[PDB]
Amino acid sequence: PSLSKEAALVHEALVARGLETPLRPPVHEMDNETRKSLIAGHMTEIMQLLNLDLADDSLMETPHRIAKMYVDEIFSGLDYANFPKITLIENKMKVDEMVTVRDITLTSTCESHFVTIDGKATVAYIPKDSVIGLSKINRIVQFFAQRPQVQERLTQQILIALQTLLGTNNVAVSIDAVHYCVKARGIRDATSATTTTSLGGLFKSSQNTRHEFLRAVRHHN
Amino acid sequence: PSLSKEAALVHEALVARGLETPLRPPVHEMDNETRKSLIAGHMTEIMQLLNLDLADDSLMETPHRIAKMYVDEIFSGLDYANFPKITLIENKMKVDEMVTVRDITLTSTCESHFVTIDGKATVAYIPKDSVIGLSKINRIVQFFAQRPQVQERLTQQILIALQTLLGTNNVAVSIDAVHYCVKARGIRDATSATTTTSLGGLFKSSQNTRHEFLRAVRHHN
Amino acid sequence: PSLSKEAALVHEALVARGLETPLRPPVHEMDNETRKSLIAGHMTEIMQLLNLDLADDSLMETPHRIAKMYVDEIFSGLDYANFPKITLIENKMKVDEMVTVRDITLTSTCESHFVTIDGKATVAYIPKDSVIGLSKINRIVQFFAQRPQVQERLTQQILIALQTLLGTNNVAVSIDAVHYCVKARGIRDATSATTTTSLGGLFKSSQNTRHEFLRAVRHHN
Amino acid sequence: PSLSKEAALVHEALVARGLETPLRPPVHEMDNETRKSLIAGHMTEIMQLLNLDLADDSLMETPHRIAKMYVDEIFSGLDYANFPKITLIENKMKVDEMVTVRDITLTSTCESHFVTIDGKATVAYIPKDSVIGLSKINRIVQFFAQRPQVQERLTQQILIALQTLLGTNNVAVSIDAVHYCVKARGIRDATSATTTTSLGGLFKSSQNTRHEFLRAVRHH
Amino acid sequence: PSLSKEAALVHEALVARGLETPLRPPVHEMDNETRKSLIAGHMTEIMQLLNLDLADDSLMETPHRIAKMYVDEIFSGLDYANFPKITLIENKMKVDEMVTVRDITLTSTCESHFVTIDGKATVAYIPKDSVIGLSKINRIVQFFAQRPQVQERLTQQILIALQTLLGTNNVAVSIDAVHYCVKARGIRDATSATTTTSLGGLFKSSQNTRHEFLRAVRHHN
Ligand SMILES: Nc1nc2c(ncn2[C@@H]2O[C@H](COP(=O)(O)OP(=O)(O)OP(=O)(O)O)[C@@H](O)[C@H]2O)c(=O)[nH]1
Ligand SMILES: Nc1nc2c(ncn2[C@@H]2O[C@H](COP(=O)(O)OP(=O)(O)OP(=O)(O)O)[C@@H](O)[C@H]2O)c(=O)[nH]1
Ligand SMILES: Nc1nc2c(ncn2[C@@H]2O[C@H](COP(=O)(O)OP(=O)(O)OP(=O)(O)O)[C@@H](O)[C@H]2O)c(=O)[nH]1
Ligand SMILES: Nc1nc2c(ncn2[C@@H]2O[C@H](COP(=O)(O)OP(=O)(O)OP(=O)(O)O)[C@@H](O)[C@H]2O)c(=O)[nH]1
Ligand SMILES: Nc1nc2c(ncn2[C@@H]2O[C@H](COP(=O)(O)OP(=O)(O)OP(=O)(O)O)[C@@H](O)[C@H]2O)c(=O)[nH]1
């Protein structure tokens, strides 16, 4: 069993741009179940170096959990077998204005500290010959979010991907997020948020389409 | 009795653009009640295939209710007999400025999943010779909304129809909505909302008027 | 005694532009007492026609009240004897910028149904040689609001009237309202509202002045 | 001319533009206290003319209070002797951008009725050679605010005054107030609000500048 | 160990433009522990001049506290030894859009009164060749914040600092702050708040970019 068509096209598009999250050739396909078990073991070791009575009934299953989380959960975006099934319909309606999906739930991790990134994404595109099923947008945002990320790069990966799938450069992405690596640690700023945006096609070149999008960005409820 | 003048003008205009909901020739006028029974029955089979005790006094009816729902309420926009009675008045006031009606209660269904689309439409037009009855706008929005829809298309319909009835291309239609095929299902995003817009004449050609509309779009209470 | 210089020019200027309220020739001065009793006679008839019990000590005075409301209150704008005494001062301050009165309380009645129109109005003007008393801007708005109305014509009247008294076509009026003929019955839309605007002088010609005004709006219930 | 270099420069600058509150030459300097006793006396007459029991313990000291309020309080801005002390600091950091001060408490009185005008001001300027202390703006507003007023003029006085003190035209004033002569009286509009503004220099000419201020005006 | 490379460039950069906080070249040069004790000496004296009972088991440790606060806390920005360890990753993602960090906690003190300055800061920049770590921006802001400040000057320092550190003139800084030397005393304005902005590169020359920034400024939660 091997990958999908849309998946391939995207992946290549990001590679051709140096936007792919830093990875090393898989070499051999290590039995996934065996991958966790090894990691879980490593976690055990760290927790011990922290003097954590594993004999207890609560922390006992954590080493396992953390492994299952990294392997089959918050980093799934790393594997393209998880790329969402994409579907498009003929732009019969001749939609020549932008379609915007705002306040998309975006959950991620800052690759620097492996800590929570809680945010919101706002995506918009102007249909060329295809209108994409709304959910696919969300699904595409959450795919790239589930990986060790750098907001700036995440935003970018979302753009090129939508552009590749929709068949248009007229796509704009915008992520607004709270970094817990900045919040629950270090400088510990509890109020600040980070906003990153990637503007394609007209959203970049057209001064009209640009400010139409940015103006409708950053909403609450 | 056949139909209505406006209804026909509109149906035609939409067909001449390919904006009519993908319909098949009704062929023979099957008795309306005959359909609800058939559908009601089909629903019975469905529920039974879901192993549900139709014997129970509650589920017992449902097939009929779901039947009556499809045919008579949420899809009544499919039959132009339910087209709203259109009424105009000479623009003796010589209103050359735009008239806007916001936060219009739009209830709809996604043709992809036959699920609730909960939205709010904003409509604007610049009076040429006539001024439409305000509630009529609300009523047209709801007409096309009451069909298995696609927001991108729904917006287009509300524009064309309104342009036709008013006699001006200067009509703008914006729709903020929550999709439950995105929220209460699949990806299960609880916070996102889709926004589509369709601009006519000036609302498109004149950068001035265009934004005067877009700046006034999206409001709460 | 007859009327007032201002109420004259205003009414005159309104008929000239064909914006005045659709009134019939004068017929003959009917004693104000007479008209009220007369309307009550009809209200009594209408109530009996509804099967109410005017005997009831409560309803018993409604015919009399409704009459008083129509002639002495909610429609008193049809009578220019009610036109507010406009007072001004020389513009020795050389105020070449726009003055703005936002959120003016506007209570009106829709003529199509003789039902409550509840709104907020924003008025702005660039003082030429005279600076009008603030509350006057309020009264003038409420004068024309106490008439069976059409939001579109109402806005236009306010504009024309202020231009006449202020001596500048540089006035702007905007009205955001909820129509209970839309909300309380018929389509029964409980979330929508209508916004109408009339831009005069620079507020229309000067692209820059227009947005300064239009931008400063949206507040109410 | 009155009693201060800054105060004098301003008062002269406003008189030179017909913006000074309509005042009649003082002539002789009757004792301040002497006026309160006279005012109080007149009010006493009014309260009597209004069939009010001054004999009662409360309304008894009200004439004096009202008299006091007029002379030493709500109309304090009339006497430039009360002008705030202005202090600026050399613009060594060269701030070629606008500095904005918003939601500046403003309490005045309509000269039409002598009733509460409750507002909020927003001032912005572009430092030329000097930068002013922040509280000074707040103070300059409230100075011209403590006079029987007309919002449209109040805004004009604020603007000029500042321009002078800062030695620049690039100043901007925007007042957003509620007039109780319109709320607890007359048409009695409990919701309305008046927003006057006075743009100068670049806030008047330069389209870009002009709107940078207006977009950031009106804030809760 | 002298300072830090970036700490030095920045310092030098700030002295070149006369944006350094007015400081002297020590004359008598002494120990840090000695400095706190002398200040605490004076605080004790002031507190006695205020007839405060230093005997009270409470007020006793106050001079010593105020001493440690001025030397190791609220003014720690005066010593470049405290500068934040900056780190940048090569902008391989080629991010050519403005990354924005909003509502950054800013705790400062007014040099005119030694009273608290409570505000929020918004920083944005266009990544040229390198992408800085987010928290760092927060840090750079707070570094210049802990000094007897002038909001105007503080804004400029964050700007230059960031420009020099990121090696780009495309940086915009805006600070919204409440000065208790305005609020808690003197004129006592309980509602006012000063806003300052500093625009570099495209944020100044490019009107297009200049408004993208100024629009996404001043946010709540
Ligand atoms: N463009 C558009 N797409 C819509 C609309 N309503 C539902 N959709 C999308 O149509 C798609 C259903 O496509 P399928 O190929 O059957 O996939 P699916 O498993 O049903 O989709 P999800 O589970 O929702 O991702 C989804 O992407 C829905 O979100 C609508 O108004 N406009
Ligand atoms: N541009 C960017 N920076 C990020 C992102 N996630 C974390 N960072 C920054 O990367 C930096 C971590 O750099 P290091 O050199 O390891 O220093 P550190 O001790 O972690 O620094 P602090 O977090 O400030 O305590 C910090 O400045 C984080 O705020 C991200 O998505 N984008
Ligand atoms: N332009 C302006 N008008 C003001 C200002 N303050 C009070 N006014 C107006 O002065 C008028 C009072 O005029 P009068 O002739 O005494 O009549 P009135 O009985 O007070 O009328 P109403 O105020 O409408 O009740 C009103 O229109 C007030 O709103 C102000 O600062 N500017
Ligand atoms: N343009 C405008 N229309 C108004 C205004 N007030 C009421 N109307 C509209 O005038 C119409 C009354 O027209 P009719 O042909 O009698 O229809 P109706 O059955 O009474 O109205 P609905 O039940 O709402 O469809 C409605 O569409 C009202 O909403 C108003 O100020 N401006
Ligand atoms: N421009 C600026 N002024 C500031 C800042 N912080 C405090 N100030 C002002 O500096 C001034 C102190 O000037 P002084 O001449 O000593 O007056 P003062 O009696 O101490 O101050 P007030 O009692 O408030 O009038 C005040 O206007 C403060 O509000 C700041 O960051 N920028």
Question: What are the respective helix, strand and coil percentages of chain B, to the nearest 5?
Answer: 40, 20, 35
Tell me the one-letter amino acid at E8. Answer: A
For residue C2, give the DSSP letter: -
> How far apart, in whole angstroms, are the C-alpha atoms of residue A98 and residue A172?
10
Residues of chain D with Cβ-Cβ distance to C133 below 8 Å are 112
Query: CA nearest A89 in B: which residue?
Result: B150
Contacts of A29 (CB under 8 A, 6+ apart): none
Q: At what angle do helices C134-145 and C151-166 cross, to 10 degrees?
A: 140
**End-to-end Cα distance, chain A:** 42
What separation in Å is there between the alpha carbon of D183 and the centre of ligand 3?
11
- Cα dihedral across residues E128, E134, E137, E139: positive or negative: negative
- Cα dihedral across residues A38, A42, A47, A53: positive or negative: positive
Residues of chain A with Cβ-Cβ distance to B18 below 8 Å are 92-94
Using DSSP, state whether E210 is helix, strand or coil.
helix
Q: Which of E141, E150, E29, E4 is nearest to E77 (CA)?
A: E141
> How far apart, in whole angstroms, are the C-alpha atoms of residue D175 and residue D101?
12
Sequence-ordered alpha helix ranges (H) in B85-166: 134-145, 151-166
Q: Which residues pair with A124 in a beta bridge?
A: A100, A172
> For residue D40, how far is the Cα from the chain centroid?
25
Q: Which of D185, D217, D184 is nearest to D198 (CA)?
A: D217
β-pair type (C171-179, C193-199): antiparallel
> How far apart, in whole angstroms, are the C-alpha atoms of residue C1 and residue B209?
48
Q: At what angle do helices E151-166 and E5-16 cross, to 10 degrees?
A: 130
| Ramachandran sector of residue D39 (left: φ over 0; alpha: ψ -120 to 50; beta: rest) | alpha
D65-94 burial, b at 16+ Cβ within 10 Å, e below that, comes to ebbeebbeebbbbbbbeebbebebeeeebe
Torsions phi, psi for E32 (to 5 deg): -65, -40
Assign 3-class secondary structure to A154-220: HHHHHHHHHHHHHCCCCEEEEEEEEEHHHHCCCCCCCCCEEEEEEECCHHHHCHHHHHHHHHCCCCC
Q: Which of A81, A214, A77 is nearest to A142 (CA)?
A: A77
Q: Which of D177, B102, E70, D196 is nearest to C177 (CA)?
A: B102
> How far apart, in whole angstroms, are the C-alpha atoms of residue A140 and residue A10?
11
**Contact of E11 with E20, CB cutoff 8 Å:** yes
Q: Which of D164, D170, D166, D199 is nearest to D12 (CA)?
A: D164
For residue A51, give the DSSP letter: T
Q: Which of D106, D113, D89, D203 is nearest to D155 (CA)?
A: D106
Distance from CA of B140 to the nearest CA of C (A): 10
CB contact under 8 A, D102 and E193: yes
**Contact of A214 with A197, CB cutoff 8 Å:** yes
Cα-Cα-Cα-Cα torsion B50, B55, B61, B66, nearest 10 degrees, comes to: 10
Could you tell me the domains of chain A? 1-85 (1.10.286.10), 86-221 (3.30.1130.10)
Answer whether D34 touches C (CB < 8 Å): no
Answer whether C150 touches B (CB < 8 Å): yes
| Kind plus residue range of the DSSP H or E element containing D46 | helix D32-49
For D29, counting Cβ atoms within 10 Å of its Cβ (0-12 exposed, 13-18 middle, 19+ buried), the class is exposed
> How far apart, in whole angstroms, are the C-alpha atoms of residue E187 and residue B136?
56
For residue C81, give the DSSP letter: G
Instruction: Give the tokens for residue A158.
Output: 């979302």
Q: Which of B221, D34, B217 is nearest to C120 (CA)?
A: B221
Specify the residue for token string 């342009």. B163
For C190, counting Cβ atoms within 10 Å of its Cβ (0-12 exposed, 13-18 middle, 19+ buried), the class is exposed
Instruction: Give the tokens for residue B39.
Output: 């559908």
Instruction: Give the tokens for residue E1.
Output: 């160990």
C142-181 burial, b at 16+ Cβ within 10 Å, e below that, comes to bbbbbbbbbbbbbbbbbbbbbbbbbebbbbbbbbbbbbbb
Residue of D19, D186, D214 with shortest CB distance to C212: D214
Please give the angle made by the CA atoms of A21, A22 and A24, to the nearest 5 degrees: 130
**Contact of C172 with C137, CB cutoff 8 Å:** no
For B45, counting Cβ atoms within 10 Å of its Cβ (0-12 exposed, 13-18 middle, 19+ buried), the class is exposed
**Contact of C127 with C144, CB cutoff 8 Å:** no
Residues of chain A with Cβ-Cβ distance to E215 below 8 Å are 214-215
Instruction: Give the tokens for residue E145.
Output: 């914040």
Instruction: Give the tokens for residue E186.
Output: 């003197």
> How far apart, in whole angstroms, are the C-alpha atoms of residue A136 and residue D210?
43
For D99, counting Cβ atoms within 10 Å of its Cβ (0-12 exposed, 13-18 middle, 19+ buried), the class is buried
> How far apart, in whole angstroms, are the C-alpha atoms of residue E123 and residue E81?
23
Q: What is the largest CA-CA distance in chain D?
A: 64
Tell me the residue ranges of DSSP E strands in B54-201: 88-90, 99-110, 115-125, 130-132, 148-149, 171-179, 193-199
Q: Read out DSSP for D181-220? A: TTTSSTT--SS-EEEEEEE-HHHHS-HHHHHHHHHT----
Residue of B93, B104, B127 with shortest CB distance to C189: B104
Contacts of A160 (CB under 8 A, 6+ apart): A10, A13, A14, A17, A19
> How far apart, in whole angstroms, are the C-alpha atoms of residue E167 and residue B14?
57
**Contact of C108 with C177, CB cutoff 8 Å:** yes
Using DSSP, state whether D29 is helix, strand or coil.
coil
For residue B53, give the DSSP letter: -
Q: What's the residue count for chain C?
A: 221
Using DSSP, state whether B193 is helix, strand or coil.
strand
Instruction: Give the tokens for residue B98.
Output: 């735009």
Specify the residue for token string 């005069």. C200
Q: At what angle do helices E134-145 and E151-166 cross, to 10 degrees?
A: 140
Distance from CA of D46 to the nearest CA of C (A): 26
Answer whether A112 touches E (CB < 8 Å): yes
> For residue D101, how far is the Cα from the chain centroid?
16
Sequence-ordered alpha helix ranges (H) in chain C: 5-16, 32-48, 62-69, 134-145, 151-166, 180-183, 202-205, 207-215
Taking residue D155's Cβ as centre, other Cβ atoms within 10 Å add up to 25
Nearest CA to ligand 2 atom 10: E133
**Contact of A110 with A180, CB cutoff 8 Å:** yes
> How far apart, in whole angstroms, are the C-alpha atoms of residue D184 and residue D150?
18
> How far apart, in whole angstroms, are the C-alpha atoms of residue E21 and residue E15?
9
Answer whether A142 touches B (CB < 8 Å): yes
Assign 3-class secondary structure to A78-120: HCHHHCCCCCEEECCCCCCCCEEEEEEEEEEEECCCCEEEEEE
Distances (CA, A) of B210 to C54, C218, D147: 55, 18, 45
Q: Read out DSSP for E149-181? A: E-HHHHHHHHHHHHHHHHT-S-EEEEEEEEEHH
Do chains B and A have 3 or more beta-carbon pairs under 8 angstroms? yes
Instruction: Give the tokens for residue D217.
Output: 């005006």
| Kind plus residue range of the DSSP H or E element containing B45 | helix B32-49
Contacts of B116 (CB under 8 A, 6+ apart): B107, B108, B109, B110, B180
Method: X-ray
A140-149 burial, b at 16+ Cβ within 10 Å, e below that, comes to bbbbbbbbbb
